[PDB]
Motif scaffolding. Sequence first.
Motif, PDB file in Angstrom:
ATOM      1  N   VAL C   9     -10.400  43.253  16.781  1.00 23.28           N
ATOM      2  CA  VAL C   9      -9.777  44.296  17.598  1.00 23.28           C
ATOM      3  C   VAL C   9      -8.905  43.612  18.677  1.00 23.28           C
ATOM      4  O   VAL C   9      -9.411  43.170  19.712  1.00 23.28           O
ATOM      5  CB  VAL C   9     -10.842  45.247  18.209  1.00 23.28           C
ATOM      6  CG1 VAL C   9     -10.214  46.584  18.583  1.00 23.28           C
ATOM      7  CG2 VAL C   9     -12.001  45.473  17.236  1.00 23.28           C
ATOM      8  N   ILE C  10      -7.589  43.551  18.431  1.00 21.14           N
ATOM      9  CA  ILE C  10      -6.731  42.482  18.992  1.00 21.14           C
ATOM     10  C   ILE C  10      -6.046  42.790  20.343  1.00 21.14           C
ATOM     11  O   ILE C  10      -5.205  43.703  20.449  1.00 21.14           O
ATOM     12  CB  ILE C  10      -5.644  42.034  17.968  1.00 21.14           C
ATOM     13  CG1 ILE C  10      -6.264  41.597  16.630  1.00 21.14           C
ATOM     14  CG2 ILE C  10      -4.792  40.897  18.535  1.00 21.14           C
ATOM     15  CD1 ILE C  10      -5.304  41.677  15.457  1.00 21.14           C
ATOM     16  N   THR C  11      -6.404  41.982  21.347  1.00 25.70           N
ATOM     17  CA  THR C  11      -5.721  41.909  22.646  1.00 25.70           C
ATOM     18  C   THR C  11      -5.839  40.463  23.196  1.00 25.70           C
ATOM     19  O   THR C  11      -6.705  39.721  22.737  1.00 25.70           O
ATOM     20  CB  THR C  11      -6.324  42.912  23.653  1.00 25.70           C
ATOM     21  OG1 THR C  11      -7.745  42.972  23.480  1.00 25.70           O
ATOM     22  CG2 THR C  11      -5.740  44.310  23.457  1.00 25.70           C
ATOM     23  N   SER C  13      -6.533  39.172  26.300  1.00 20.24           N
ATOM     24  CA  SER C  13      -7.693  38.966  27.164  1.00 20.24           C
ATOM     25  C   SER C  13      -8.944  38.743  26.324  1.00 20.24           C
ATOM     26  O   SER C  13      -9.729  37.818  26.588  1.00 20.24           O
ATOM     27  CB  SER C  13      -7.895  40.166  28.092  1.00 20.24           C
ATOM     28  OG  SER C  13      -8.156  41.348  27.354  1.00 20.24           O
ATOM     29  N   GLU C  17     -11.373  35.486  26.014  1.00 19.23           N
ATOM     30  CA  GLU C  17     -12.819  35.618  26.215  1.00 19.23           C
ATOM     31  C   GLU C  17     -13.572  34.954  25.072  1.00 19.23           C
ATOM     32  O   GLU C  17     -14.532  34.200  25.314  1.00 19.23           O
ATOM     33  CB  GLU C  17     -13.266  37.086  26.368  1.00 19.23           C
ATOM     34  CG  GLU C  17     -13.040  37.677  27.756  1.00 19.23           C
ATOM     35  CD  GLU C  17     -13.745  39.013  27.960  1.00 19.23           C
ATOM     36  OE1 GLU C  17     -14.954  39.114  27.659  1.00 19.23           O
ATOM     37  OE2 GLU C  17     -13.093  39.965  28.436  1.00 19.23           O
ATOM     38  N   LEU C  23      -3.815  31.872  27.342  1.00 16.84           N
ATOM     39  CA  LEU C  23      -3.293  33.143  26.882  1.00 16.84           C
ATOM     40  C   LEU C  23      -1.947  33.025  26.220  1.00 16.84           C
ATOM     41  O   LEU C  23      -1.670  33.829  25.391  1.00 16.84           O
ATOM     42  CB  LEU C  23      -3.337  34.229  27.975  1.00 16.84           C
ATOM     43  CG  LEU C  23      -4.718  34.913  28.094  1.00 16.84           C
ATOM     44  CD1 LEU C  23      -5.686  34.079  28.922  1.00 16.84           C
ATOM     45  CD2 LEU C  23      -4.612  36.319  28.661  1.00 16.84           C
ATOM     46  N   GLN C  37       2.724  43.488  28.130  1.00  9.94           N
ATOM     47  CA  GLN C  37       1.273  43.638  27.858  1.00  9.94           C
ATOM     48  C   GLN C  37       1.094  44.051  26.381  1.00  9.94           C
ATOM     49  O   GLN C  37       1.972  44.714  25.814  1.00  9.94           O
ATOM     50  CB  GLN C  37       0.640  44.687  28.794  1.00  9.94           C
ATOM     51  CG  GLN C  37      -0.170  44.126  29.961  1.00  9.94           C
ATOM     52  CD  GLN C  37      -1.676  44.293  29.782  1.00  9.94           C
ATOM     53  OE1 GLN C  37      -2.179  45.415  29.743  1.00  9.94           O
ATOM     54  NE2 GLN C  37      -2.403  43.180  29.693  1.00  9.94           N
ATOM     55  N   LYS C  38      -0.042  43.685  25.778  1.00 10.92           N
ATOM     56  CA  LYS C  38      -0.229  43.772  24.313  1.00 10.92           C
ATOM     57  C   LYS C  38      -1.372  44.697  23.870  1.00 10.92           C
ATOM     58  O   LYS C  38      -2.354  44.875  24.591  1.00 10.92           O
ATOM     59  CB  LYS C  38      -0.469  42.369  23.733  1.00 10.92           C
ATOM     60  CG  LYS C  38       0.486  41.281  24.214  1.00 10.92           C
ATOM     61  CD  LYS C  38       1.934  41.587  23.860  1.00 10.92           C
ATOM     62  CE  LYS C  38       2.888  40.568  24.459  1.00 10.92           C
ATOM     63  NZ  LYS C  38       4.302  41.027  24.362  1.00 10.92           N
ATOM     64  N   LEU C  39      -1.223  45.263  22.670  1.00 16.31           N
ATOM     65  CA  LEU C  39      -2.236  46.122  22.037  1.00 16.31           C
ATOM     66  C   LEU C  39      -2.117  46.027  20.518  1.00 16.31           C
ATOM     67  O   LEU C  39      -1.078  46.410  19.970  1.00 16.31           O
ATOM     68  CB  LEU C  39      -2.028  47.582  22.445  1.00 16.31           C
ATOM     69  CG  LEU C  39      -2.622  48.059  23.768  1.00 16.31           C
ATOM     70  CD1 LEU C  39      -2.117  49.462  24.065  1.00 16.31           C
ATOM     71  CD2 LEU C  39      -4.147  48.010  23.733  1.00 16.31           C
ATOM     72  N   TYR C  40      -3.159  45.541  19.836  1.00 18.03           N
ATOM     73  CA  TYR C  40      -3.090  45.383  18.375  1.00 18.03           C
ATOM     74  C   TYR C  40      -4.409  45.672  17.638  1.00 18.03           C
ATOM     75  O   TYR C  40      -5.506  45.419  18.160  1.00 18.03           O
ATOM     76  CB  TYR C  40      -2.594  43.972  18.024  1.00 18.03           C
ATOM     77  CG  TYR C  40      -1.111  43.732  18.242  1.00 18.03           C
ATOM     78  CD1 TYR C  40      -0.167  44.161  17.305  1.00 18.03           C
ATOM     79  CD2 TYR C  40      -0.651  43.054  19.377  1.00 18.03           C
ATOM     80  CE1 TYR C  40       1.192  43.934  17.497  1.00 18.03           C
ATOM     81  CE2 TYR C  40       0.705  42.822  19.576  1.00 18.03           C
ATOM     82  CZ  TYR C  40       1.621  43.264  18.635  1.00 18.03           C
ATOM     83  OH  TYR C  40       2.963  43.037  18.830  1.00 18.03           O
TER      84      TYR C  40
END
Lengths: 138, 48, 41, 98, 157, 180, 154
Positions: C9-11, C13, C17, C23, C37-40
């Motif tokens: 579940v890709i981001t 941050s 972690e 980063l 900023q990213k969301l994937y």
Amino acid sequence: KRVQTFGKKKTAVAVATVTNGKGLIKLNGKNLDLVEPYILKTKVYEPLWLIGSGKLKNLDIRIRVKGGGQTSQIYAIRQAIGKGIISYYQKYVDESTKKELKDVLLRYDRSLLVGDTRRCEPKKFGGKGARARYQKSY
Amino acid sequence: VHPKKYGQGSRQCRVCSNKHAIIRKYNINICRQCFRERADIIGFKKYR
Amino acid sequence: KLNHAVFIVITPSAIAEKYKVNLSVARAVINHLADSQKLYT
Amino acid sequence: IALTSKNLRAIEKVCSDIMKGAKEKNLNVSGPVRLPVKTLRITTRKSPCGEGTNTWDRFELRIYKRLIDLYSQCEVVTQMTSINIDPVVEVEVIITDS
Amino acid sequence: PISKKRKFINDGVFQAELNEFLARILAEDGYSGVEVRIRELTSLVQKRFFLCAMAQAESLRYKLLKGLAVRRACYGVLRHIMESGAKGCEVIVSGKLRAQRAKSMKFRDGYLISTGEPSKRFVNTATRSAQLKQGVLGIKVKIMLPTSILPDNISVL
Amino acid sequence: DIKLFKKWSYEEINIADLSLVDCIAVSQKACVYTPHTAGRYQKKRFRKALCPIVERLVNSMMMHGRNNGKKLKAIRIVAYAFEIIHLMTGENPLQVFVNAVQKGGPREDSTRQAVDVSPLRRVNQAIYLICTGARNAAFRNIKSISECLAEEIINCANESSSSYAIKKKDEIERVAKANR
Amino acid sequence: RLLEPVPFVKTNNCIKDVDADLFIRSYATHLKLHNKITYPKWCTFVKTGKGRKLAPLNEDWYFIRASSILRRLYLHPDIGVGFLRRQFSSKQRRGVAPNHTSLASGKILRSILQQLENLGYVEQNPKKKGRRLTTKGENAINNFARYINKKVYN
RNA sequence: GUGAUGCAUGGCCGUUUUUAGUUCGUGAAUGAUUUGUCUGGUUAAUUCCGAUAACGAACGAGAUCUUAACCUGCUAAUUAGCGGCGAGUACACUGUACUUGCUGCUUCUUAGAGGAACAUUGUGUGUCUAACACAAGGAAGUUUAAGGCAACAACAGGUCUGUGAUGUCCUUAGAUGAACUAGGCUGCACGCGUGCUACACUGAUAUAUAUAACGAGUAAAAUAUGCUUGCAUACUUUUCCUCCGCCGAAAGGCGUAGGUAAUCUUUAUCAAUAUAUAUCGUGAUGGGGAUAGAUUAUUGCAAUUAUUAAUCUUGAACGAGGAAUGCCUAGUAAGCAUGAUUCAUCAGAUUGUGCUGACUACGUCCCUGCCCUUUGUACACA
Ligand SMILES: [Mg+2]
Ligand SMILES: [Mg+2]
Ligand SMILES: [Mg+2]
Ligand SMILES: [Mg+2]
Ligand SMILES: [Mg+2]
Ligand SMILES: [Mg+2]
Ligand SMILES: [Mg+2]
Ligand SMILES: [Mg+2]
Ligand SMILES: [Zn+2]
């Protein structure tokens, strides 16, 4: 035929010339596709959405904006649109429809028809801002 | 005699010949205290 | 302190972690996967 | 014709008078256009000394420039200008075809 | 060629200068004027160029110079003002005055509005510094003129 | 159709507090597509009640001097948070936000002795607390603000004392209890 | 990325009906493909303006700049070098003293303009003021914009 | 006389105080005095009401003035626009974007005169008095917002270093006058101010994109002739804002162009925060730019104790700040810039102007400071 009203937020007068046409809607020489930032785009499109996109296929719109910053300009544009469409309806289309549109606008919010009266208050000596004085150490 | 043409000591108040605190905007050339007294006659009214 | 690495579940941050990474490296990884900023997913 | 002055009401009166004069005959007079009042602001610090919480005072000498056009001969315009008038309103006539 | 702004300021300055010149010259006169024996004055101006409050003040100064009992003089002035139809007056005289230390002396008669643009309009004010024995006596005269109507009144018929 | 962010409709949302409904108006005229309203919410005492909650959140986010008067940025951040909520921990983000708000208010406070809290005030506190916590999380971490904020929101929704705001609220409650 | 459901039709005719950055990028790409404009000598180790205190970090920044300039020219009637400089200004942090606005390094801009004129895209008009677009150049730009629009639609 | 004395004074300014306070006429109550000018309610207000040995005034408040707020789709049209329309250049459908040339409307642009809110209508609370709270209407409902003005009495407040306002005393050629040459006000174990810049990722970096408002802008030099770098003679642009065109990494330079200004600088855009896309990746880190080192300019007769500016490099303190204490309630705080004032040159200052636009009250007397009635006082220099 052709109707000219203004919007007004801070300083930033957006003058909306609303004419008979095919339904394009523009700013100085540019489409409303641009405006500038993607986030605020909705504040310009909102009146159109409220009224319906089919209602504006009879009406071309050009908008000349001058003065102010970015957000204020957007607001002014919105205001112009709101006043503009309604003004057009009052003259060249029916009254009932105009009334309906007005009601819709009211239900959504103020600012579309009636203007934001706020303006930058004069800075006063002994400080940097309007109220904000300097500093005493005793 | 030494260059007295460009500096604070070059020119002065019209009124009292003081080299300090001259209103030099619009070629008024009056030291500000004097201007404050003669602001009525010159036609400078305080509104806001 | 936490000196994160570069060589292995890709981001971003989340990536940071999980595998303990810079980063920029996370960003690179994301790009690779795809291939401010990213969301994937 | 350019009417530069310091006092608003007086200037207005003068303008009115000239309009009246024009309306007699023979004058295609464009209406009085008042120009952007370029206000001379001086912000002086009150108090000769440095004592007291330094209050400034924004003076404003607000000059009213007024403008008016005509299609006429010089003598006639001169005559029109002669409303008597006084030291307060500064008049200037331009007698150009362009 | 000189700009409009520049011109206006210059004119103002000139006016001020003229006023000052008049003050310097006419210690013996009921001076107010400023609209253009006198020949000399005219010449001077050419060289340079290429009821009322001020008058009252001047009179007071003259009296002081002459050497009166002060209070009496002030009273006389007040009376004169009253005669001349003034709704109100005020004179102040501060300075040395008899004693060494201090001593500001007020002399009011009728009512004297102080605050508002009415004050600016409907009072004539004037300030002279009469040089005397061991310093200066400081006149300030303030006259409230006949109004063209005051903002406070609401005259029902 | 009436909508927010052209995505989360808030016709599906629910509430179940009464008091909170009375306080925060997400209504027929407090419909909004992007938070940025130039509303006159502080010219009256209770006009802040008409204010949409998203707007309030954005305002709260806007805090801290060097980031102050950067509304657009704040809005963007909130949008990102909403998106995150939608995606990971899958739910209508508005609902989650509402839940968080409900959770957040300390119901009783201390004074110079224990007293109750008005709903509006509680809501405001919650708004503040959530943003402040988020800010704290962000500051000199790495994570990113939007992510952190989202996490905080989720925690609030859950009603779990891993996040900061909730902890603070709990502490306040404890203090109140101690007082009376 | 950009596309969305709008309440009107867009007359995709001139560059004012195109999104800017993307268009600029496209133009840069085209330029690169052509090899129509050079990269002088000093370009590869100069700083674009007082305020930048650092090199561009874009490799083909020159091309981008040129593209931007073209757009600017199209927008305005007659545009100088000074105006261009002003347009590409930024904040100069003077370390400890607060920021001022910083006029761009005009030399590079001038060079770019010269290059364009050589190639036959811009035109020093003897009437009016400094260098506007030449009609052919304008047409080309319009065509490019149209192409871009088409691509976006696709 | 920028000598001495503001405790000799003038004027002006500050504070008491922008709060609401000061005073009189007559009356009444040995005297200073009191009353009026008040238990209470109300007000931003000795603002009103109501009670009453007072009744009635006047200044102060309020009104007035200046802006900013919304209209007349009446008054006017440049040095503002909008169209009108020729002329095209691109592309759409069977109009849209962009420039040159010519000349009904006044919505926007300017600015004069008018209008509009009075708590109006609605409903509460209130001696159903003065008035307040809410709702509708509306451009606007805290005298709509902001100022300006500023009573009486002072302070032994400041200023004679603003003045040829001005007293006395001093000084008056080995001048404490003026003029010239440097040097110093900037010197530094340290204490207290006002600020700026920071301590990062809501961020730096670097490209791209967006878009303000108030403004402000005119004795020295050039070229030629005649003689010994100098003078004299003749003659004309330049002295401030800089368009633009070239040179210059940069700063700046040279050439020219408009502007004595709604015309030109320049303003249908002079700014930065903005926003979008890339490089970083929490590491005193590319956060941070102190301190330093060495040039290239500009200003000026003169730049060192570096005017400022630019270029390269130097990479310090600082990881959000202890005791204390300041400012602030809506276009406000804060952030971001910017015009002007000083200016030969030089903002980190001030003063204006805008742009991004929060939080929290909507009250209270707990502190602090003012004011009031009562009370006590041996204080009145309080
Ligand atoms: Mg009064
Ligand atoms: Mg004193
Ligand atoms: Mg009494
Ligand atoms: Mg008043
Ligand atoms: Mg000093
Ligand atoms: Mg200073
Ligand atoms: Mg305090
Ligand atoms: Mg005693
Ligand atoms: Zn003087």
